[PDB]
Amino acid sequence: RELADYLCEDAQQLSLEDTFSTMKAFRDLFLRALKENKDRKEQAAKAER
Amino acid sequence: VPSHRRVNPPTLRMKKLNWQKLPSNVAREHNSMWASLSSPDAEAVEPDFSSIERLFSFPAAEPKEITFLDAKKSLNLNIFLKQF
Amino acid sequence: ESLLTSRQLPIFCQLILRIGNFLNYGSHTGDADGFKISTLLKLTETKSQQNRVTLLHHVLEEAEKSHPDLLQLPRDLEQPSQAAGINLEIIRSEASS
Amino acid sequence: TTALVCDNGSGLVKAGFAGDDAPRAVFPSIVGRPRHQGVMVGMGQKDSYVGDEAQSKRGILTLKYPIEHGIITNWDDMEKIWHHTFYNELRVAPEEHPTLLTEAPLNPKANREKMTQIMFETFNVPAMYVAIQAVLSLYASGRTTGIVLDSGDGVTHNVPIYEGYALPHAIMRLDLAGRDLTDYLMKILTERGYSFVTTAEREIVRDIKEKLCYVALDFENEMATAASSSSLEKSYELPDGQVITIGNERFRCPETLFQPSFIGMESAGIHETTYNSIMKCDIDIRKDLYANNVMSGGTTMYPGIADRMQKEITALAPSTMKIKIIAPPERKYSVWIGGSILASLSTFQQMWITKQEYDEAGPSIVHRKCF
Amino acid sequence: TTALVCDNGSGLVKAGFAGDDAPRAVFPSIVGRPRHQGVMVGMGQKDSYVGDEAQSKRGILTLKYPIEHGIITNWDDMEKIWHHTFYNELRVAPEEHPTLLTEAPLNPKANREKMTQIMFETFNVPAMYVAIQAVLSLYASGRTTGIVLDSGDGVTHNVPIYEGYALPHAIMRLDLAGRDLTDYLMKILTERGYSFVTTAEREIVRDIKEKLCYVALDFENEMATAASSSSLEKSYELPDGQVITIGNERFRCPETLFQPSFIGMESAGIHETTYNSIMKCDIDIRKDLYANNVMSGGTTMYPGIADRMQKEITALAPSTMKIKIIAPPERKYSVWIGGSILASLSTFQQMWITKQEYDEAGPSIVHRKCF
Amino acid sequence: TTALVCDNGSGLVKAGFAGDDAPRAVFPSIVGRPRHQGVMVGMGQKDSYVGDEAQSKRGILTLKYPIEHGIITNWDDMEKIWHHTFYNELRVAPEEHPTLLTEAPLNPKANREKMTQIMFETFNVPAMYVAIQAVLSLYASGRTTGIVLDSGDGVTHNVPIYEGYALPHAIMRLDLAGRDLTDYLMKILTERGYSFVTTAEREIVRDIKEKLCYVALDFENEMATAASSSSLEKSYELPDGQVITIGNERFRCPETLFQPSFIGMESAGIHETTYNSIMKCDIDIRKDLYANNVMSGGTTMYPGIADRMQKEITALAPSTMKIKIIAPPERKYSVWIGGSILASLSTFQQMWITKQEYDEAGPSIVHRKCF
Ligand SMILES: Nc1ncnc2c1ncn2[C@@H]1O[C@H](COP(=O)(O)OP(=O)(O)O)[C@@H](O)[C@H]1O
Ligand SMILES: Nc1ncnc2c1ncn2[C@@H]1O[C@H](COP(=O)(O)OP(=O)(O)O)[C@@H](O)[C@H]1O
Ligand SMILES: Nc1ncnc2c1ncn2[C@@H]1O[C@H](COP(=O)(O)OP(=O)(O)O)[C@@H](O)[C@H]1O
Ligand SMILES: [Mg+2]
Ligand SMILES: [Mg+2]
Ligand SMILES: [Mg+2]
């Protein structure tokens, strides 16, 4: 109920499972974005070399 | 204090990030995260709008080694020759 | 408890809200006081002109220089990631039975 | 005495008594034979495991499905299946109890001939009947009119009935159901690296399909969501302790029912099958068939199939008539339940196939008595 | 200037030159589009095979028939069929030769409208004529009076003509011919287990129907002979080498012509259609229509249809008047032969539909010029 | 610019230019690392030996195969394999040469993702393509239609093609080829007393299998002949000077292709895979798959395999139709040869995956541009 009021969702329609799945996908996209940025910077440095 | 809404308009046409917008009265709850962001003492990050406007806007409208052979037979001859 | 007491997640939500308020000006979606949880999934939709850099990659590229504490953000979201896929109803029914 | 209902479907055999609300003996229809070398002598090493024992011991077995697309290919295996469901699971004497059987329409006749001959000469009942599954589903629904789509594990068939009259020319059979979905899920699970090649792994892929898969309301938007983010991915635990995670294959697997070209079949989807079954009937009854689309079978256990079915039929039908999908929560066993309705009716008691009729007419009375 | 005669029937396009006795180009009217994935680059992979090439490569193709029950459903496919029969088969310029056309009676008018529009705006001839097929069959029969039952692949129609006068109110149409027989034959072959579901397999069932099926002289006695002894059973060789055997299905397939309730139609048989077509005429002219039952079409190519037709009409008609069936051996091409007779006639030259008449009158002169 | 063909199979990398007859660099794909303590200092002791140097110096090395059943497990080893086959074998710059790689069907997609990403970002090309090996074998055979059985060192896969059209639902994969034959021969040479346990001894058992083994025409008669008299026994000389003599293991070892239950696999043999791949297709092409059984790969190089597989398919197929195995004398390198015709084809030049398209579309174009 506190997280339903926190994320401004309907309390009778919030499920914790899709909330945590959205956070799981957001963390996976976060790590994939960091990995792609690191690979892009490494390949740009290798191309400049 | 509406610090999040105090953003300058952009010069160029921007690619629309689609989202499901909340109602305002739902966002002004007591336990709301956006209510804690609406306090001016919270930590705010100033974005660099110049690079976002730069990138995510819409776009607008010699004879060294001469040979008489072809390259396939010449490279086959190079493989044949360089093993000697 | 980690979602309710996260420090960097409201920082990132105000950052994406300011970027969207820049980015969706002149439309019905602009001038928003808040948005749903599914906005973070669609961040790879906004591509650059070269179709190489998404908006998430550029936000973390800017966050690597100016505000590195946003890179502490998977630590707060590790326990939601571990908690995902757990059905509360079946374990509560098993405990009640 | 009290009659028996034995839905001997392609995937799961559901047997039980008449006048009951739930099928007492539900177990899958497989025959498991050992393929490795037995070294420990004694302790009763059976050469053929049938039913739940084949399921529990499947790591050392070759599992054979005796029914393929509603057609019994192996008859000794189905004799073993009938022996297990009569003597071991239900624990009944078949010579003093009538037994109702279920069959898909547009079946080869010699299959019905051999079922009649075996059930009167090996499992010799006092009486029996062979019934269309869609009529039993409509009798389970408690209504007289409607069109029934029934999709088991081998056969997806559409039968429309108006006021107790079934139109035979509008009955449409499609050989695409849950076993083809399981084989297509085997084919698409190799993209993620998970190799499932054995017959034992077919049950694991079937359990993945039962527990995690769902019918998408819009397929292209769900592909766009799966390509964008990994939010709808879900994890499953294998019996060796390995944890897999699947994404778009949750809804690409049941989409073969709506798009049969995934597995190479030229035929149209089940919504087009339903619509062509409606349009082959008379014009005066179609309004009754639009509002009473009854679904049955375990292939309609995906929790997104009714809204997709209503959306596709509402796109197909004219908009001035109501589309309503009758999807009860117990439509998995409804083929059993309406049989338990039909075996307990007083008006059914003269419609039995007695032993005297079989003895005077050979195994040919099933073509003239059953529909 | 030699005219062209192009019978664009439902079954097979039969085109050729006027004054000849046999048509030069007989080829089936299908359009075949590939459905699987092409991997081999180059060598002219056409996206649509038309005619004989679609027949000879049908194992990788979806085949579409442009005509359904005498009505052209798909028009781009018919444009491809007309381009194939003009440019590839006869190899003639259409703009220098007239081209006769054939049409079933009780057709919706927009088919004739779009026929006129395409033949004067895409395949623009100096002249054309659209004719009733039964009138052409009577012209090839060489007699002025008679009633013609013409049964193609989509339309079975009865037209009586007395002394060159065709009575319009007695003309009858029934939407039951050879494609519906092929559909019913695919339905009843599933009793013996041979599942023919694809569009390619429809041609195999059509070849089975052309080679093996026949009209029974009595139907219940042939049930007695077929059920008693296996003397009538015939084997057929499939293109994969498998050999099938069919029994009573040889004569159950054409009896849909004499009993339309097999495929769920309320209408009466073709003999009752002929008797009601004769009885709707005047009482004076019924005697000549009894003695001149001319028949045409490929559906009249079963080797038992004339004696059954004579038996049913002689049972229906009063016995004092003579019943005779006129069945020439070349009645398959008799529509083309009658078109070649009518095209070469000197009195037909003022009856042409010219380019100038079309330009002054729109595509509406075909209703007032033709019958 | 000339193109490169590089069949990077499980066992032997076969690489060369386009338009050439024979693959110039044929060498096995192994990475060898030392496992003992080196006491001498100086004169260039390398930490990793790739190719023929690992074969010559194998008595002090652990050899690792980077590819297992067509799926690359170790990627730094495969990077070194590609580095050796570009820089040291062909002596070419990959930045100025297009490259056609081969791939087995039903491969995991992330394997193709990593092939595209490493091939475009370590050895960055102007263009590169990933093809199916069976399509290249049909290119080498010089015919358009046929079923191709390819059997390399890790994957035996069956793909049927008719008139340029591969049927994707009929493609079958079996993870049984020459490496599993080598491991089974290591298992069964222990019966005669010869012990082989190391990775270097796998090469000696592979040389025994390449030099002495042959496919029996009839297995039971050959077992009876080898048990009766020692006429089938043959001798071989080891590098330590010991002379071995083997009997039934000459034809028990390739029999695992026809009997996969020798190594504990549930799946059927290659003849049943070929027959089921033909029977999964549409019917009208099946005759053209019987006369064009194209074989490829080094596993089908035993001098008894064509007559045996002809016997097995002729037992399996209907007898009214010809079976013809297309077994060329150069079927070891036929994947490379058909890659050389496809690389030299004029129409193939639009189907390259250019570097610009890779930069625009990420590493995702290889799912949609390739097969
Ligand atoms: N909860 C579920 N979710 C999705 N699919 C299911 C579920 N339960 C069963 N199924 C599928 O439906 C089939 C059961 O339908 P049913 O008509 O009982 O088959 P049968 O009677 O032929 O054994 C099974 O083969 C299974 O693949
Ligand atoms: N020898 C035959 N025996 C039986 N049926 C035939 C024979 N030849 C053709 N048919 C059937 O008759 C049809 C051809 O009739 P046709 O007069 O060409 O019809 P249409 O011209 O309207 O297409 C074919 O579809 C075929 O099924
Ligand atoms: N002459 C031969 N006789 C029998 N087997 C052979 C012969 N030559 C090669 N082989 C076997 O076939 C394989 C070669 O097939 P190939 O397609 O080149 O494998 P890869 O391409 O994966 O290295 C080798 O692993 C070897 O075991
Ligand atoms: Mg069922
Ligand atoms: Mg005709
Ligand atoms: Mg290979």
Which two three-digit tokens encode residue F238? 């080891």
Residue E66, SS3? coil
The token pair that represents E62 in the structure block: 């979806």
Mutate to test the pocket of ligand 1, among D5, D10, D12 (most ligand atoms within 8 A of CB): D12
Size of chain C, expressed as the number of residues it contains:
97
Top residue of E37, E61, E180, E197 to mutate, by most chain D CBs within 10 Å, is E197
Q: How far apart are the CA of A48 and the nearest CA of chain D, in angstroms?
A: 31
Listed by start position, the domains of chain D span: 1-27+70-134+334-370, 28-69, 135-181+271-333, 182-270
In terms of phi and psi (left: phi > 0; alpha: psi -120 to 50; beta: otherwise), the region of D264 is left
CA-to-CA separations, E160 to E172, E223, E288, E301, F192, in angstroms, rounded: 10, 34, 10, 21, 93
How many residues comprise chain D? 371
Cβ D266–E36 below 8 Å, yes or no? no
> How remote is the CA of residue B48 from the centroid of ligand 2, in Å?
77
Contacts of D109 in chain E (CB under 8 A): 191-192
Which residue of chain F has the CA closest to C50? F360
* Residue F38 CA, ligand 5 centroid: distance in Å: 91
Q: CA D133 to CA D7: how far, in whole Å?
A: 9
Query: β-pairing, F99-103 with F127-132?
Result: parallel
| Separation between Cα atoms, residue B23 and residue B27, nearest integer Å | 6
Placement of tokens 């498991």 in the chain: D32
Alpha helices in F26-132 (DSSP H): 52-56, 75-83, 109-121
What is the sign, positive or negative, of the torsion defined by CA atoms of D209, D212, D218, D223?
A: negative
Flag whether residue F164 sits within 8 Å of chain E, measured between CB atoms: yes
Residue type, position E310, single letter: Q
In this complex, the residue of B71, B72, B79 whose CB is nearest that of residue F91 is B79
| Amino acid, res. E1 | T
For residue C41, give the chain D residue with the closest CA.
D229
Main-chain phi, psi angles of F256, to 5 degrees:
-65, -25
DSSP A1-49: -HHHHHTT--TTT--HHHHHHHHHHHHHHHHHHHHHHHHHHHHHHHHH-
Distance, in angstroms, between A19 CA and closest chain D CA? 10
Residue E82 to residue F249: CA distance in whole angstroms = 66
E296 in ligand 2 pocket by Cβ < 6 Å? no
HSE (CB half, 13 Å, CA atoms) of C93? 4
> Contact, D365 vs D331, CB < 8 A?
no
**Integer Cα distance of E158 and E293 in angstroms:** 10
Q: How far does Cα E172 stand from its chain's mean position?
A: 16
With touching defined as 3 or more inter-chain CB pairs under 8 Å, the answer for chains B and D is no
Please name the residue ranges forming H helices in chain F. 52-56, 75-83, 109-121, 133-141, 178-188, 199-212, 219-228, 249-252, 270-279, 286-290, 305-316, 334-343, 355-361, 365-368
Phi-psi region of B67 (alpha: psi -120 to 50; beta: other; left: phi over 0): beta
CATH class of the domain defined by E182-270: alpha beta
Cα–ligand 4 centroid distance for F190 (angstroms): 53
CB F116 within 8 A of CB F145: no
Backbone angles phi, psi at E370, to 5 degrees: -80, 170
Cα distance between residue D2 and residue D17, in whole Å:
7
Q: Are F20 and B71 within 8 A, CB to CB?
A: no
Residues 15..74 of B with a Cβ closer than 8 Å to F: which? 71-72
CA distance A49 to chain B (A): 25
Atom 10 of ligand 3 has which residue's CA nearest to it? Answer: F298
Q: Where are the beta strands (DSSP E) in E170-292?
A: 172-174, 234-237, 243-246
Name the residue type at position D240.
D
- The identity of residue A22, as a single letter, is T
Domain F1-27+70-134+334-370 in CATH 3.20.20.120? The answer is: no
CA nearest neighbour of F163 among E57, E32, E241: E57
Is residue D168 within 8 angstroms of chain E, CB to CB?
yes
| Assigned token pair, D226 | 């799966």
Distance from CA of D230 to the nearest CA of A (A): 5
Note whether D176 and D263 are within 8 A (CB). yes
* Helix D305-316 vs helix D270-279: crossing angle, to nearest 10: 50
- Put simply, the answer to whether F361 touches C50 (Cβ < 8 Å) is no
Resolution of the entry in angstroms: 3.0
Q: Identify the helix (H) or strand (E) that includes residue F371.
A: none
Question: Does ligand 1 come within 6 angstroms of the Cβ of D70?
Answer: no
Tell whether ligand 2 has an atom less than 6 A from the beta carbon of residue E233.
Answer: no
Token pair of C88 as six digits:
């509360």
Helix (H) / strand (E) element for F5: namely strand F4-8
CB atoms within 10 A of CB B58: 9
Measured distance CA(F349)–CA(D44) in Å, rounded:
66
| Ligand index nearest the alpha carbon of residue E10 | 2
Cα D363 from Cα D220, distance rounded (Å): 51
Q: If you measure from the C-alpha of residue D10 to the centroid of ligand 1, how many angstroms do you get, rounded to a whole number?
A: 10
Residue-level length of chain F = 371
Task: Specify whether the CB–CB gap between B77 and B68 falls below 8 A.
Answer: no
Q: How far is E35 from chain D (nearest CA, A)?
A: 8
Dihedral of CA B74/B75/B78/B80: which sign?
A: negative
- Going by beta carbons, is chain A in contact with chain C, meaning 3 or more pairs sit under 8 Å apart? yes
Token pair 């194998």 is found at F58
- Phi, psi at D33, each rounded to 5°: -115, 140
Would the CB of E358 count as within 6 Å of ligand 2? no
Distance CA F57, CA D286 (A): 81
The half-sphere exposure of F10 on its side-chain side, counting CA atoms within 13 A, is 22
Q: How far apart are CA C28 and CA B20, in angstroms?
A: 11
Query: Token pair for residue A9?
Result: 């969702």
> Beta partners for D131?
D102
- Enumerate residues 6+ apart whose C-beta is below 8 A from D297: D149, D150, D151, D152, D156, D177, D331, D332, D335
Ligand 3 nearest-atom number relative to CA F12: 23
Query: Cα(D33)–Cα(D77) distance, rounded to whole angstroms?
Result: 11
Nearest to B79 by CA among E48, F2, D48: F2
Count Cα neighbours of D228 within 13 Å in the Cβ-side half-sphere: 21
Per-residue tokens: B60: 């607008």
Q: Is D232 on the interface with A (CB under 8 A)?
A: yes
Q: How far is CA D317 from CA D261, D274, F90, in A?
A: 23, 11, 65
As a whole number of angstroms, the distance between CA C33 and CA B25 comes to 9
Nearby residues of B21 by Cβ (< 8 Å), 6 or more positions away: C29, C32, C34, C35, C36
- Best residue for ligand 1 mutational test, from D52, D67, D210 (most atoms within 8 Å of Cβ): D210
Separation of alpha carbons E293 and E280, rounded Å: 16
Long-range contact set of residues F307-312: C-beta below 8 Å, sequence gap at least 24:
F307/F217, F308/F215, F308/F216, F308/F217, F308/F258, F309/F270, F309/F271, F309/F274, F311/F217, F312/F258, F312/F269, F312/F271
Tell me which residues have their CB closer than 6 angstroms to ligand 3.
F 7, 9-12, 152-153, 178, 206, 209-210, 297-299, 301-302, 332
Tell me if domain D28-69 and domain D135-181+271-333 are identical in fold. Answer: no
- Judge: C85–D231 Cβ closer than 8 Å, yes or no: no
- Decide if B14 touches F, using CB distance below 8 A: no
Q: Is the CB of E102 under 6 A from ligand 2?
A: no
Q: Which two tokens stand for residue D185?
A: 């899920």
Bridge partners (DSSP) listed for residue F326 = F294
Does any CB of chain E come closer than 8 Å to the CB of residue D223?
no
Q: Distance of CA E267 to CAs D162, E108, E256, E367, F89, Å?
A: 21, 20, 11, 29, 81
- Quote the distance between the C-alpha of residue D318 and its chain's center: 31
d(CA C23, CA C30): 8
Distance F86 CA to ligand 3 centre (A): 21
Specify the CATH number for D135-181+271-333; select among 1.10.357.10, 3.30.70.20, 3.40.50.300, 3.30.420.40.
3.30.420.40
CB E12 near ligand 2, within 6 Å: yes
Domain E28-69: which CATH number of 3.40.50.300, 3.40.50.720, 2.30.36.70, 2.60.40.2380: 2.30.36.70
- Report the first-to-last Cα separation within chain D, whole angstroms: 25
Q: Do chains D and C touch (3 or more CB pairs under 8 A)?
A: yes
> Choosing among B67, B74, B75, B78, which should be mutated to test the F contact, i.e. which has the most F CBs within 10 A?
B75
- Asked whether the beta carbons of residue D228 and residue C85 sit closer than 8 angstroms, the reply is no
Instruction: Tell me how far the alpha carbon of residue D297 lies from the centroid of ligand 1, in angstroms.
Output: 7
Place of tokens 């590195």: C68
CB contact under 8 A, A25 and C41: yes
